[PDB]
C-alpha cells in the first residue's frame, strides 16, 4: 500500500518514527511538512500533528484521499490515534478496519477570489472599528439583519471551534447543516441559526470588514457567498472511535 | 452663565445651531471639538453628539464642572436632551431645574502609563491571534483563570456597552460595583463576575495583547491594575429623565 506522511513543524522526528514503523508493511511515497505547498496523492495520508495540521493536510490532499491523524500537539476532533496505539493502527490498516467520516468543505466567493474552508469563515470589524450592519440572506429568503462585530459561518466540523466560544450549538459531524453565528450583536441576538447544507448564504456588510478563512486573515470585503463544496476530506477512524468521548474530554461538555 | 460647547467631529452644524440659541440668553466662552486637548472650565459644559462624545468631554471637564449632553436622534445613557429639546433645556437652565448625577471613573495603570475610563477597559487578542491565558486576581483573593479572546473590565456606566454585547448583566449606574467579563472563553465560562467598587483588580495575560480604553485603542500590554478613581464627572438631567425608558428604547430590553 502507498502512503504519504505529513508532519507539523517541530514534530519531524516523530514523523520519522512513524515512517519506519509503517515501512515494514507499506511503501511510504512521500514524507514532508504539512506546510510545504503541493498536491499529495497516495492511497492514504498519515498526518502527525493536530486539527490545525490535519486542516493544512486536507487542503493538500488529492480529492478523495483518506487521511489519518496521530495526536502530536493535543487532543482534537480530527486525530484518530495516539502514538502508543501505532500497532493498533497497523492492525486496523492491515484489514482496512475503519469507520470513514466525510468532512466537506465550504466554498467562499468574494472580491478576494475563491476560498475553501473546512471549519468556518468569519467577517469581523477592526479592533478600532465601530460595530457594523450585517445582512444575512439565506437561499431565496428575505434577510436577517444584525448590528454586530461580525458573523461566523460554520461547518459541523468547525461548530466546536470559535462558534462554540460565542454560544453556538455542538453539532455532530454527520449533520447536513451550516451554522450562522453573529459576533457580539446588539438586541441580545446571540443565537445561532442552523440551515440545511444545500442552502447557500450571502453575507453583506455596510462597510468593508476583515475576512478570516479557517482563522487566517485574508483581506477586507463588503460581501461573500458561501456554500457547501463537493470537495471533502475523508477521515479514517478506529472502529471504537467515539466523538462523544472527545466532547467530554476536550470541550468539557457533559462530564459526570 | 458662562458656557462651553463641545461637539463631535462631524456635528459642527448641530453645535452651531445649539450655539446661536444658547447665546441669546447666555455666554459661549468656548466652542470646539470634544476630542481636542485641554482642560475646560466653565459654569456648564454643553456637549453635542452621543455617549462617545460625552465620554471624551468628561475627561476634559475640570473636576466640578457640571455637564449636559445633546444627542442627534434617539436618547442615550450619557445625554440628557435631544436636539429639538433646546426649548425645555434653556427653560431648565434658567430655573436650574435639574437632577444632579455623579459617575466615577476607573483608574488603569500598566506598562503604557495611567489611563482614565468612564466605561471600561478591554484586553483583547489581535484578529489574527490565538486565544490567550488570562489571570484575573481580585483585590485579596486567589486567581480566576480563563483561556479566551480577552476580558472587559467595566463600570456600571460601561455595563451597557461592550460588556452587554458579550453576555454581561445590565448594571444600574448607582451600583457600587465593578464588572469583569471574559470575551469568548472556552469551557462555557460566559458569565460575568461582579465585585464591590472598592476592590482593585489585576489582570495578567500570557502575552502582550491589545488594550482598549473607553473603546479607544491604546497599545499592547501584558498586565493591568484597575481600581475606582476619586475623579468623577457630574451630569445634569431634567427631572423627567428616566434611565429605564432608555434601556427599553435603546437597548431593546424589556419592551411591552
Short mmCIF file of C-alpha atoms in Angstrom, two decimals:
data_model
loop_
_atom_site.label_atom_id
_atom_site.label_comp_id
_atom_site.label_asym_id
_atom_site.label_seq_id
_atom_site.Cartn_x
_atom_site.Cartn_y
_atom_site.Cartn_z
CA UNK A 1 0.00 0.00 0.00
CA UNK A 2 1.11 3.56 -0.92
CA UNK A 3 1.20 6.09 1.92
CA UNK A 4 2.19 9.71 2.25
CA UNK A 5 3.19 11.11 5.63
CA UNK A 6 2.86 14.79 6.55
CA UNK A 7 4.04 16.33 9.82
CA UNK A 8 3.87 19.62 11.79
CA UNK A 9 6.98 21.84 12.11
CA UNK A 10 8.69 20.58 15.28
CA UNK A 11 7.40 17.01 15.00
CA UNK A 12 9.70 15.81 12.19
CA UNK A 13 11.46 13.22 14.38
CA UNK A 14 8.03 11.88 15.37
CA UNK A 15 7.19 11.65 11.67
CA UNK A 16 10.41 9.64 11.20
CA UNK A 17 9.48 7.19 13.93
CA UNK A 18 6.07 6.64 12.25
CA UNK A 19 7.62 6.28 8.77
CA UNK A 20 9.95 3.48 9.92
CA UNK A 21 7.15 1.54 11.68
CA UNK A 22 4.86 1.90 8.63
CA UNK A 23 7.64 0.96 6.21
CA UNK A 24 7.56 -2.69 7.39
CA UNK A 25 4.26 -3.41 5.62
CA UNK A 26 3.78 -0.49 3.22
CA UNK A 27 5.56 1.83 0.80
CA UNK A 28 5.93 5.39 2.05
CA UNK A 29 5.78 7.51 -1.10
CA UNK A 30 6.19 10.99 0.33
CA UNK A 31 7.37 12.42 3.59
CA UNK A 32 7.17 16.15 4.35
CA UNK A 33 5.94 19.23 6.18
CA UNK A 34 2.19 19.89 6.25
CA UNK A 35 3.40 23.45 5.49
CA UNK A 36 5.08 22.83 2.12
CA UNK A 37 2.67 23.68 -0.77
CA UNK A 38 1.89 20.94 -3.33
CA UNK A 39 -0.64 18.22 -4.20
CA UNK A 40 -0.24 14.87 -2.42
CA UNK A 41 -1.52 11.63 -3.98
CA UNK A 42 -1.47 8.33 -2.08
CA UNK A 43 -3.91 5.56 -1.14
CA UNK A 44 -3.67 7.16 2.33
CA UNK A 45 -2.15 10.18 4.08
CA UNK A 46 -0.83 9.96 7.65
CA UNK A 47 -0.70 13.30 9.49
CA UNK A 48 1.44 13.92 12.53
CA UNK A 49 0.21 16.97 14.48
CA UNK A 50 -3.30 18.19 15.46
CA UNK A 51 -6.50 19.61 14.00
CA UNK A 52 -4.51 22.55 12.71
CA UNK A 53 -2.10 20.15 10.95
CA UNK A 54 -4.86 17.94 9.59
CA UNK A 55 -6.60 21.05 8.24
CA UNK A 56 -3.46 22.05 6.30
CA UNK A 57 -3.01 18.45 5.06
CA UNK A 58 -6.66 18.25 3.94
CA UNK A 59 -6.03 21.17 1.61
CA UNK A 60 -3.01 19.37 0.11
CA UNK A 61 -4.83 16.06 -0.50
CA UNK A 62 -5.96 14.79 -3.88
CA UNK A 63 -9.74 14.96 -3.67
CA UNK A 64 -10.71 11.55 -2.30
CA UNK A 65 -7.54 10.64 -0.38
CA UNK A 66 -8.36 9.20 3.07
CA UNK A 67 -6.39 10.60 5.96
CA UNK A 68 -5.43 9.66 9.46
CA UNK A 69 -4.02 11.83 12.27
CA UNK A 70 -1.71 10.90 15.13
CA UNK A 71 -2.14 13.25 18.11
CA UNK A 72 1.03 15.41 18.07
CA UNK A 73 0.25 18.50 19.90
CA UNK A 74 -3.04 17.80 21.74
CA UNK A 75 -6.41 16.35 21.69
CA UNK A 76 -8.61 17.30 18.77
CA UNK A 77 -11.56 16.08 16.73
CA UNK A 78 -9.58 15.35 13.58
CA UNK A 79 -6.98 13.00 15.11
CA UNK A 80 -7.64 9.29 15.23
CA UNK A 81 -4.78 7.67 17.13
CA UNK A 82 -2.22 8.31 19.81
CA UNK A 83 1.38 7.32 19.27
CA UNK A 84 1.21 4.42 21.79
CA UNK A 85 -1.55 2.99 19.59
CA UNK A 86 0.64 2.73 16.48
CA UNK A 87 0.49 -1.10 16.49
CA UNK A 88 -3.32 -0.90 16.72
CA UNK A 89 -3.26 1.40 13.67
CA UNK A 90 -1.08 -1.12 11.75
CA UNK A 91 -3.53 -3.90 12.64
CA UNK A 92 -6.62 -1.85 11.62
CA UNK A 93 -4.84 -0.83 8.44
CA UNK A 94 -3.88 -4.41 7.53
CA UNK A 95 -7.63 -5.23 7.21
CA UNK A 96 -8.81 -1.71 6.37
CA UNK A 97 -10.96 -1.80 9.57
CA UNK A 98 -12.07 1.80 9.97
CA UNK A 99 -15.17 3.93 10.08
CA UNK A 100 -14.71 6.58 7.35
CA UNK A 101 -16.10 10.07 8.01
CA UNK A 102 -16.72 12.52 5.19
CA UNK A 103 -15.94 16.13 6.16
CA UNK A 104 -16.94 18.55 3.43
CA UNK A 105 -15.53 21.98 2.79
CA UNK A 106 -17.37 25.21 2.27
CA UNK A 107 -16.63 27.41 -0.76
CA UNK A 108 -16.40 31.13 -0.23
CA UNK A 109 -16.68 33.55 -3.08
CA UNK A 110 -15.91 37.31 -2.87
CA UNK A 111 -13.81 40.13 -4.38
CA UNK A 112 -10.84 38.35 -2.81
CA UNK A 113 -11.42 35.32 -5.10
CA UNK A 114 -12.49 31.79 -4.20
CA UNK A 115 -11.55 30.30 -0.85
CA UNK A 116 -12.17 26.89 0.73
CA UNK A 117 -12.75 26.31 4.45
CA UNK A 118 -13.09 23.14 6.44
CA UNK A 119 -14.09 24.87 9.67
CA UNK A 120 -15.58 28.28 9.10
CA UNK A 121 -15.41 31.72 7.58
CA UNK A 122 -15.59 34.96 9.57
CA UNK A 123 -16.33 38.55 8.76
CA UNK A 124 -15.23 40.91 11.55
CA UNK A 125 -14.69 44.58 12.23
CA UNK A 126 -11.28 46.01 13.09
CA UNK A 127 -10.48 46.28 16.80
CA UNK A 128 -10.51 50.09 16.14
CA UNK A 129 -13.78 49.77 14.22
CA UNK A 130 -17.31 50.66 15.26
CA UNK A 131 -19.88 47.86 15.12
CA UNK A 132 -21.35 47.06 11.65
CA UNK A 133 -24.69 46.48 9.97
CA UNK A 134 -24.55 42.95 8.56
CA UNK A 135 -27.14 41.44 6.24
CA UNK A 136 -27.51 37.65 6.13
CA UNK A 137 -29.52 36.34 3.16
CA UNK A 138 -30.24 32.62 3.18
CA UNK A 139 -31.28 30.89 -0.11
CA UNK A 140 -34.26 32.82 -1.59
CA UNK A 141 -35.43 34.11 1.72
CA UNK A 142 -35.81 37.63 2.91
CA UNK A 143 -32.90 38.82 5.02
CA UNK A 144 -31.81 38.69 8.67
CA UNK A 145 -30.06 41.85 9.94
CA UNK A 146 -27.56 42.34 12.72
CA UNK A 147 -25.68 45.25 14.17
CA UNK A 148 -22.62 43.39 15.41
CA UNK A 149 -18.84 42.94 15.43
CA UNK A 150 -19.21 40.33 12.69
CA UNK A 151 -20.62 36.89 11.73
CA UNK A 152 -19.10 33.34 11.56
CA UNK A 153 -20.43 30.75 9.08
CA UNK A 154 -19.55 27.27 10.19
CA UNK A 155 -19.50 23.68 9.08
CA UNK A 156 -20.29 20.82 11.61
CA UNK A 157 -16.52 20.30 11.91
CA UNK A 158 -16.00 23.95 12.78
CA UNK A 159 -19.00 24.07 15.22
CA UNK A 160 -16.72 23.09 18.09
CA UNK A 161 -14.25 25.86 17.29
CA UNK A 162 -14.73 29.71 17.51
CA UNK A 163 -18.58 29.34 17.03
CA UNK A 164 -18.84 27.34 20.23
CA UNK A 165 -16.95 30.12 22.13
CA UNK A 166 -19.71 32.60 21.16
CA UNK A 167 -22.76 30.40 22.03
CA UNK A 168 -23.36 28.11 19.11
CA UNK A 169 -24.55 24.54 19.50
CA UNK A 170 -22.39 21.41 19.44
CA UNK A 171 -23.15 19.98 16.01
CA UNK A 172 -22.40 16.30 15.40
CA UNK A 173 -20.12 15.98 12.33
CA UNK A 174 -22.64 13.87 10.37
CA UNK A 175 -25.32 16.62 10.37
CA UNK A 176 -26.16 18.06 6.96
CA UNK A 177 -26.29 21.68 8.04
CA UNK A 178 -24.48 25.03 8.06
CA UNK A 179 -24.36 27.30 11.10
CA UNK A 180 -24.56 31.06 11.17
CA UNK A 181 -23.49 32.94 14.30
CA UNK A 182 -23.45 36.71 14.78
CA UNK A 183 -20.45 38.02 16.80
CA UNK A 184 -21.44 40.27 19.72
CA UNK A 185 -24.72 41.56 18.20
CA UNK A 186 -26.95 44.27 19.79
CA UNK A 187 -30.52 43.42 20.87
CA UNK A 188 -29.27 40.24 22.51
CA UNK A 189 -29.35 38.25 19.22
CA UNK A 190 -26.69 35.87 20.47
CA UNK A 191 -28.25 32.74 18.93
CA UNK A 192 -27.01 30.77 16.01
CA UNK A 193 -29.09 29.76 13.05
CA UNK A 194 -28.85 26.23 11.61
CA UNK A 195 -29.77 25.77 7.91
CA UNK A 196 -29.63 22.75 5.55
CA UNK A 197 -26.21 22.28 3.94
CA UNK A 198 -27.77 22.57 0.46
CA UNK A 199 -28.71 26.25 1.08
CA UNK A 200 -26.28 29.00 0.15
CA UNK A 201 -25.66 32.12 2.21
CA UNK A 202 -24.80 35.63 1.11
CA UNK A 203 -23.37 37.98 3.72
CA UNK A 204 -23.15 41.74 3.13
CA UNK A 205 -21.83 44.45 5.43
CA UNK A 206 -22.39 48.20 5.28
CA UNK A 207 -18.60 48.81 5.01
CA UNK A 208 -15.62 46.54 4.22
CA UNK A 209 -14.54 44.37 7.15
CA UNK A 210 -11.99 41.60 7.69
CA UNK A 211 -12.50 38.12 6.26
CA UNK A 212 -10.82 35.15 8.03
CA UNK A 213 -10.87 31.72 6.39
CA UNK A 214 -10.27 28.92 8.90
CA UNK A 215 -8.74 31.63 11.12
CA UNK A 216 -6.29 33.17 8.60
CA UNK A 217 -6.69 36.88 7.78
CA UNK A 218 -7.25 37.17 4.00
CA UNK A 219 -8.41 40.73 3.22
CA UNK A 220 -11.36 43.15 3.60
CA UNK A 221 -14.84 42.77 1.94
CA UNK A 222 -18.38 44.02 1.97
CA UNK A 223 -19.79 40.76 0.51
CA UNK A 224 -19.32 36.98 0.45
CA UNK A 225 -21.27 34.00 -0.89
CA UNK A 226 -20.90 30.71 0.90
CA UNK A 227 -21.98 27.20 0.04
CA UNK A 228 -21.12 23.56 0.59
CA UNK A 229 -18.37 22.37 -1.78
CA UNK A 230 -18.16 18.90 -3.31
CA UNK A 231 -14.56 18.82 -2.16
CA UNK A 232 -14.22 16.91 1.03
CA UNK A 233 -11.70 15.14 3.08
CA UNK A 234 -12.07 11.53 4.29
CA UNK A 235 -11.02 10.83 7.88
CA UNK A 236 -10.26 7.25 8.95
CA UNK A 237 -11.34 6.31 12.46
CA UNK A 238 -10.59 3.22 14.55
CA UNK A 239 -13.80 1.15 14.98
CA UNK A 240 -14.09 2.10 18.66
CA UNK A 241 -13.69 5.82 17.93
CA UNK A 242 -16.18 7.87 19.92
CA UNK A 243 -16.68 11.55 19.16
CA UNK A 244 -18.66 11.97 22.41
CA UNK A 245 -15.54 10.98 24.42
CA UNK A 246 -13.88 13.94 22.75
CA UNK A 247 -16.81 16.36 23.56
CA UNK A 248 -16.33 15.39 27.21
CA UNK A 249 -12.50 15.28 27.41
CA UNK A 250 -11.76 18.27 25.18
CA UNK A 251 -14.78 20.64 25.31
CA UNK A 252 -15.66 19.81 28.92
CA UNK A 253 -19.31 19.27 27.99
CA UNK A 254 -21.33 16.54 29.62
CA UNK A 255 -18.80 15.27 32.24
CA UNK A 256 -20.24 13.18 35.05
CA UNK B 1 -23.92 81.82 32.73
CA UNK B 2 -20.52 81.08 31.17
CA UNK B 3 -20.90 78.10 28.86
CA UNK B 4 -18.51 75.90 26.88
CA UNK B 5 -19.78 73.88 23.92
CA UNK B 6 -18.22 70.66 22.68
CA UNK B 7 -19.32 68.83 19.54
CA UNK B 8 -18.31 65.53 17.87
CA UNK B 9 -16.08 65.68 14.70
CA UNK B 10 -18.98 65.71 12.18
CA UNK B 11 -21.66 67.58 14.20
CA UNK B 12 -20.12 71.08 13.80
CA UNK B 13 -23.59 72.02 12.42
CA UNK B 14 -25.71 70.93 15.45
CA UNK B 15 -23.13 72.58 17.68
CA UNK B 16 -23.57 75.79 15.66
CA UNK B 17 -27.38 75.87 15.98
CA UNK B 18 -27.15 74.95 19.72
CA UNK B 19 -24.55 77.77 19.96
CA UNK B 20 -26.73 80.53 18.41
CA UNK B 21 -29.72 79.54 20.59
CA UNK B 22 -27.71 79.37 23.84
CA UNK B 23 -26.06 82.79 23.17
CA UNK B 24 -29.47 84.57 23.19
CA UNK B 25 -29.61 84.16 26.98
CA UNK B 26 -26.05 83.07 27.91
CA UNK B 27 -22.36 83.47 27.02
CA UNK B 28 -20.49 80.85 24.96
CA UNK B 29 -16.90 81.31 26.16
CA UNK B 30 -15.53 78.23 24.36
CA UNK B 31 -16.60 76.43 21.20
CA UNK B 32 -14.80 73.39 19.80
CA UNK B 33 -14.16 69.69 19.43
CA UNK B 34 -14.56 67.37 22.42
CA UNK B 35 -11.59 65.36 21.06
CA UNK B 36 -9.31 68.47 21.06
CA UNK B 37 -6.85 68.64 24.02
CA UNK B 38 -7.09 70.76 27.17
CA UNK B 39 -8.91 71.13 30.46
CA UNK B 40 -12.19 73.05 30.16
CA UNK B 41 -13.56 75.21 32.99
CA UNK B 42 -16.95 76.89 32.83
CA UNK B 43 -20.22 77.11 34.80
CA UNK B 44 -21.53 74.44 32.40
CA UNK B 45 -20.32 72.27 29.52
CA UNK B 46 -22.87 71.54 26.78
CA UNK B 47 -21.85 68.52 24.68
CA UNK B 48 -23.37 67.67 21.24
CA UNK B 49 -23.06 64.14 19.81
CA UNK B 50 -23.64 60.82 21.59
CA UNK B 51 -22.38 58.83 24.55
CA UNK B 52 -18.95 58.59 22.88
CA UNK B 53 -18.63 62.40 22.83
CA UNK B 54 -19.74 62.94 26.44
CA UNK B 55 -17.23 60.32 27.36
CA UNK B 56 -14.38 62.31 25.75
CA UNK B 57 -15.75 65.53 27.17
CA UNK B 58 -15.87 64.15 30.79
CA UNK B 59 -12.12 63.74 30.58
CA UNK B 60 -11.69 67.46 29.78
CA UNK B 61 -14.10 68.85 32.43
CA UNK B 62 -12.42 70.44 35.45
CA UNK B 63 -13.32 68.25 38.47
CA UNK B 64 -16.55 70.02 39.44
CA UNK B 65 -17.89 71.44 36.13
CA UNK B 66 -21.38 70.00 35.52
CA UNK B 67 -22.09 68.58 32.08
CA UNK B 68 -25.07 68.12 29.79
CA UNK B 69 -25.14 66.13 26.55
CA UNK B 70 -27.34 66.58 23.47
CA UNK B 71 -27.96 63.69 21.08
CA UNK B 72 -28.74 63.86 17.38
CA UNK B 73 -31.56 61.23 17.34
CA UNK B 74 -32.78 58.74 19.96
CA UNK B 75 -31.90 59.35 23.66
CA UNK B 76 -28.63 57.83 25.05
CA UNK B 77 -27.43 56.95 28.70
CA UNK B 78 -24.96 59.88 28.89
CA UNK B 79 -27.02 62.55 27.07
CA UNK B 80 -30.00 64.34 28.67
CA UNK B 81 -31.76 66.16 25.84
CA UNK B 82 -32.48 65.62 22.12
CA UNK B 83 -31.52 68.36 19.65
CA UNK B 84 -35.15 69.53 19.34
CA UNK B 85 -35.42 69.91 23.12
CA UNK B 86 -33.36 73.14 23.32
CA UNK B 87 -36.69 74.79 24.32
CA UNK B 88 -37.04 72.73 27.53
CA UNK B 89 -33.32 72.74 28.34
CA UNK B 90 -32.89 76.51 28.23
CA UNK B 91 -36.06 76.55 30.34
CA UNK B 92 -34.46 74.17 32.88
CA UNK B 93 -31.19 76.09 32.68
CA UNK B 94 -32.88 79.42 33.54
CA UNK B 95 -34.59 77.78 36.54
CA UNK B 96 -31.80 75.26 37.37
CA UNK B 97 -34.48 72.55 37.14
CA UNK B 98 -32.04 69.65 37.20
CA UNK B 99 -31.45 66.29 38.74
CA UNK B 100 -27.70 66.13 39.61
CA UNK B 101 -25.91 62.85 38.92
CA UNK B 102 -22.28 61.78 39.50
CA UNK B 103 -20.32 58.93 37.91
CA UNK B 104 -16.80 57.98 38.97
CA UNK B 105 -14.05 56.89 36.62
CA UNK B 106 -11.78 53.89 36.84
CA UNK B 107 -8.06 54.07 37.00
CA UNK B 108 -5.87 51.87 34.93
CA UNK B 109 -2.17 51.58 35.49
CA UNK B 110 0.03 49.44 33.20
CA UNK B 111 3.30 49.40 31.19
CA UNK B 112 1.82 52.11 28.98
CA UNK B 113 1.11 54.61 31.73
CA UNK B 114 -2.00 55.72 33.57
CA UNK B 115 -5.37 55.95 31.86
CA UNK B 116 -8.88 57.10 32.90
CA UNK B 117 -12.11 55.42 31.75
CA UNK B 118 -15.75 56.17 32.40
CA UNK B 119 -16.93 52.98 30.61
CA UNK B 120 -14.42 50.12 30.52
CA UNK B 121 -11.04 48.71 29.59
CA UNK B 122 -10.62 45.68 27.35
CA UNK B 123 -7.70 43.38 26.80
CA UNK B 124 -8.18 41.54 23.50
CA UNK B 125 -6.05 39.46 21.10
CA UNK B 126 -5.35 40.54 17.50
CA UNK B 127 -7.90 39.34 14.86
CA UNK B 128 -5.06 37.05 13.64
CA UNK B 129 -4.02 35.77 17.09
CA UNK B 130 -4.64 32.57 19.03
CA UNK B 131 -6.64 32.54 22.28
CA UNK B 132 -4.80 33.61 25.45
CA UNK B 133 -4.38 32.51 29.05
CA UNK B 134 -5.78 35.22 31.31
CA UNK B 135 -5.35 35.51 35.07
CA UNK B 136 -7.80 37.66 36.98
CA UNK B 137 -6.87 38.49 40.58
CA UNK B 138 -9.43 40.41 42.50
CA UNK B 139 -8.08 42.51 45.43
CA UNK B 140 -7.11 39.94 48.16
CA UNK B 141 -8.23 36.70 46.72
CA UNK B 142 -6.70 33.78 44.77
CA UNK B 143 -6.98 33.91 40.98
CA UNK B 144 -9.62 33.13 38.41
CA UNK B 145 -8.21 31.75 35.10
CA UNK B 146 -9.56 31.78 31.53
CA UNK B 147 -8.50 30.76 28.05
CA UNK B 148 -10.22 33.39 25.94
CA UNK B 149 -10.06 36.27 23.38
CA UNK B 150 -9.71 38.61 26.34
CA UNK B 151 -11.52 40.31 29.25
CA UNK B 152 -13.53 43.50 29.70
CA UNK B 153 -13.49 45.40 33.00
CA UNK B 154 -16.42 47.76 33.23
CA UNK B 155 -18.08 50.38 35.45
CA UNK B 156 -21.85 50.48 35.90
CA UNK B 157 -21.96 53.09 33.07
CA UNK B 158 -19.93 50.86 30.72
CA UNK B 159 -22.07 47.77 31.52
CA UNK B 160 -24.42 48.65 28.65
CA UNK B 161 -21.75 49.00 26.01
CA UNK B 162 -19.34 46.20 25.01
CA UNK B 163 -19.91 44.05 28.16
CA UNK B 164 -23.60 43.66 27.33
CA UNK B 165 -22.80 42.62 23.72
CA UNK B 166 -20.88 39.64 25.16
CA UNK B 167 -23.24 38.39 27.90
CA UNK B 168 -22.88 40.77 30.82
CA UNK B 169 -25.70 41.97 33.09
CA UNK B 170 -27.34 45.44 32.82
CA UNK B 171 -25.94 47.24 35.83
CA UNK B 172 -27.80 50.35 37.06
CA UNK B 173 -25.49 53.38 37.23
CA UNK B 174 -25.82 53.90 41.00
CA UNK B 175 -24.40 50.43 41.97
CA UNK B 176 -21.11 50.47 43.74
CA UNK B 177 -19.61 47.65 41.72
CA UNK B 178 -17.14 46.68 39.01
CA UNK B 179 -17.84 44.05 36.39
CA UNK B 180 -15.43 41.56 34.85
CA UNK B 181 -16.45 39.82 31.61
CA UNK B 182 -14.33 37.33 29.66
CA UNK B 183 -14.52 37.51 25.88
CA UNK B 184 -15.41 34.18 24.31
CA UNK B 185 -13.72 31.84 26.83
CA UNK B 186 -13.53 28.01 26.46
CA UNK B 187 -15.45 25.66 28.82
CA UNK B 188 -18.54 27.87 28.53
CA UNK B 189 -17.47 30.46 31.10
CA UNK B 190 -19.63 33.15 29.51
CA UNK B 191 -20.70 34.75 32.78
CA UNK B 192 -19.54 37.95 34.27
CA UNK B 193 -18.23 38.47 37.79
CA UNK B 194 -19.49 41.42 39.85
CA UNK B 195 -17.28 42.81 42.65
CA UNK B 196 -17.50 45.87 45.04
CA UNK B 197 -16.22 49.18 43.62
CA UNK B 198 -13.64 49.38 46.43
CA UNK B 199 -11.78 46.26 45.21
CA UNK B 200 -8.85 46.59 42.83
CA UNK B 201 -8.37 44.11 40.01
CA UNK B 202 -5.14 42.88 38.45
CA UNK B 203 -5.25 41.23 35.00
CA UNK B 204 -2.28 39.27 33.59
CA UNK B 205 -2.17 37.68 30.13
CA UNK B 206 0.25 35.05 28.83
CA UNK B 207 1.43 37.52 26.11
CA UNK B 208 1.04 41.20 25.26
CA UNK B 209 -2.38 41.78 23.85
CA UNK B 210 -4.29 44.89 22.83
CA UNK B 211 -5.64 47.33 25.37
CA UNK B 212 -8.65 49.47 24.64
CA UNK B 213 -9.69 52.35 26.91
CA UNK B 214 -13.31 53.52 26.62
CA UNK B 215 -13.18 51.89 23.16
CA UNK B 216 -10.11 53.86 22.08
CA UNK B 217 -7.18 51.57 21.36
CA UNK B 218 -4.07 52.44 23.47
CA UNK B 219 -1.42 49.78 22.72
CA UNK B 220 -0.16 46.42 23.88
CA UNK B 221 0.04 45.24 27.47
CA UNK B 222 0.51 42.05 29.50
CA UNK B 223 -0.51 43.38 32.92
CA UNK B 224 -3.02 45.93 34.20
CA UNK B 225 -4.17 47.17 37.62
CA UNK B 226 -7.70 48.59 37.67
CA UNK B 227 -9.35 50.46 40.55
CA UNK B 228 -12.02 53.11 41.12
CA UNK B 229 -10.73 56.69 40.82
CA UNK B 230 -11.65 59.56 43.14
CA UNK B 231 -12.32 61.57 39.98
CA UNK B 232 -15.85 61.90 38.73
CA UNK B 233 -18.00 63.83 36.24
CA UNK B 234 -21.34 65.41 37.10
CA UNK B 235 -24.24 65.26 34.69
CA UNK B 236 -27.36 67.41 34.70
CA UNK B 237 -30.65 65.67 33.97
CA UNK B 238 -34.16 67.05 33.52
CA UNK B 239 -36.43 65.76 36.39
CA UNK B 240 -38.39 63.64 33.87
CA UNK B 241 -35.31 61.73 32.68
CA UNK B 242 -35.75 58.01 33.21
CA UNK B 243 -32.90 55.62 32.59
CA UNK B 244 -35.25 52.60 32.16
CA UNK B 245 -37.06 54.23 29.22
CA UNK B 246 -33.57 54.25 27.65
CA UNK B 247 -32.93 50.54 28.45
CA UNK B 248 -36.18 49.81 26.65
CA UNK B 249 -35.74 52.34 23.83
CA UNK B 250 -32.01 51.99 23.03
CA UNK B 251 -31.01 48.51 24.34
CA UNK B 252 -34.29 46.79 23.42
CA UNK B 253 -34.54 45.24 26.85
CA UNK B 254 -38.00 44.99 28.45
CA UNK B 255 -40.47 46.46 25.91
CA UNK B 256 -44.12 45.52 26.40
#
